[PDB]
Amino acid sequence: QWALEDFEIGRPLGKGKFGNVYLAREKQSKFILALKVLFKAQLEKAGVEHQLRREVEIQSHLRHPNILRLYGYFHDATRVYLILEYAPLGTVYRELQKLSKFDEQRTATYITELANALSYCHSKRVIHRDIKPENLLLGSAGELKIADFGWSVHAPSSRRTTLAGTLDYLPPEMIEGRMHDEKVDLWSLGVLCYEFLVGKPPFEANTYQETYKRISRVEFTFPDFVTEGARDLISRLLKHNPSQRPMLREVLEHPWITANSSKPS
Ligand SMILES: Nc1ncnc2c1ncn2[C@@H]1O[C@H](COP(=O)(O)OP(=O)(O)O)[C@@H](O)[C@H]1O
Ligand SMILES: CCSc1nnc(NC(=O)OC)s1
Ligand SMILES: [Mg+2]
Ligand SMILES: [Mg+2]
Numbered sequence: 001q002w003a004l005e006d007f008e009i010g011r012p013l014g015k016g017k018f019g020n021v022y023l024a025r026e027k028q029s030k031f032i033l034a035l036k037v038l039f040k041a042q043l044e045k046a047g048v049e050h051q052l053r054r055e056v057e058i059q060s061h062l063r064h065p066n067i068l069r070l071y072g073y074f075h076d077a078t079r080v081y082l083i084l085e086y087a088p089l090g091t092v093y094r095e096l097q098k099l100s101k102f103d104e105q106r107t108a109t110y111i112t113e114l115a116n117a118l119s120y121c122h123s124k125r126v127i128h129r130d131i132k133p134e135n136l137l138l139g140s141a142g143e144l145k146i147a148d149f150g151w152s153v154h155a156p157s158s159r160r161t162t163l164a165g166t167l168d169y170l171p172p173e174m175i176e177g178r179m180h181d182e183k184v185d186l187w188s189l190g191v192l193c194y195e196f197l198v199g200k201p202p203f204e205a206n207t208y209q210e211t212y213k214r215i216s217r218v219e220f221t222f223p224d225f226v227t228e229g230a231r232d233l234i235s236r237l238l239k240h241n242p243s244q245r246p247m248l249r250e251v252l253e254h255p256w257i258t259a260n261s262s263k264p265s
Contacts, residue, residue, distance in 0.1 A: 002073075002081075006027055008024065010023040010024060013086075014091070016134075017164060019036045021037070021084075023035075023086065033071070037079055037080075038079060040078055040079060051150045054150065055082070055148075055149045056070065066113045066114070066146065067121075067145060068137055068147040087137035088140050092110070093136070096133055106196070107197050108256065108259075108260035110136075112265070114136075114146070114189060114192070118146075127184060127185055129152060130152070133195070135148035156179060156181045157179075157181070158177075163175075168203060169201065171183070171215075171242070175212060175216065181242065183242035184242070186245045193233060194220070194234050202220035202234075218238060229254075237251075
């Protein structure tokens with residue numbers, strides 16, 4: 001259906017391991033969108049074709065205000081192109097670098113939006129498994145949208161593919177290559193809540209080997225400025241035993257979340 005000739009390409013929006021993402025406009029409708037470009041040679045080399053097909057299949061069928069749309073795809077013998085909803089206010093990652101830390105209202109609102117999106121995903125037994133600031137985008141009204149579904153699967157699951165970069169957002173069961181389920185996303189939600197308030201993730205270290213140790217032992221501490229409510233929520237989420245982590249309804253109804261969020265469930 002769609003082909004490259006149908007679009008005018010513009011400003012580079014960002015780069016990922018495989019993804020090279022551009023602003024683009026469809027010629028006859030003037031529709032503005034984002035084009036995620038993948039090189040076939042790199043995909044074949046890394047053996048991640050199944051990850052691409054998952055991304056397309058899972059993301060194109062989901063419909064939620066806090067989840068980024070995928071409209072379709074095409075391909076041209078060196079490249080694969082994913083047609084995405086354009087997020088005009090950028091990434092949460094960039095926003096965090098701008099401000100250093102988020103205040104409690106901003107943090108609680110983001111967490112509410114994430115939990116709503118994840119609740120929708122989990123109701124289809126879809127687990128994202130790669131929730132981190134560079135994969136959280138911002139809509140025109142500043143609302144958070146989950147993106148990058150290349151690592152997503154149906155639960156329960158093992159990990160069939162190599163862990164690439166940072167360990168910072170992954171729970172013990174996944175770093176230790178064990179069996180895992182929906183509760184992995186809830187661990188990541190705790191990591192994010194901490195990073196939003198503090199400015200860095202709670203298990204950060206200088207080496208892979210040391211980060212690994214801090215995660216498997218759940219070794220984190222709080223700076224003095226983190227309030228009691230925030231500490232309670234974060235401590236509930238960062239549990240070694242997955243079954244002990246709260247349900248998303250508990251997150252959305254937590255007193256600190258209700259006191260500080262500006263959006264509802
Ligand atoms: N729809 C979009 N709108 C605006 N920027 C985007 C969009 N999609 C991706 N980006 C930017 O490109 C980067 C990489 O996109 P992503 O889909 O995460 O690629 P990868 O799968 O390689 O991680 C993102 O971190 C973001 O900065
Ligand atoms: C250049 C094609 S962009 C596109 N295709 N289909 C769409 N559907 C849509 O907006 O549904 C809400 S947007
Ligand atoms: Mg990404
Ligand atoms: Mg990806």
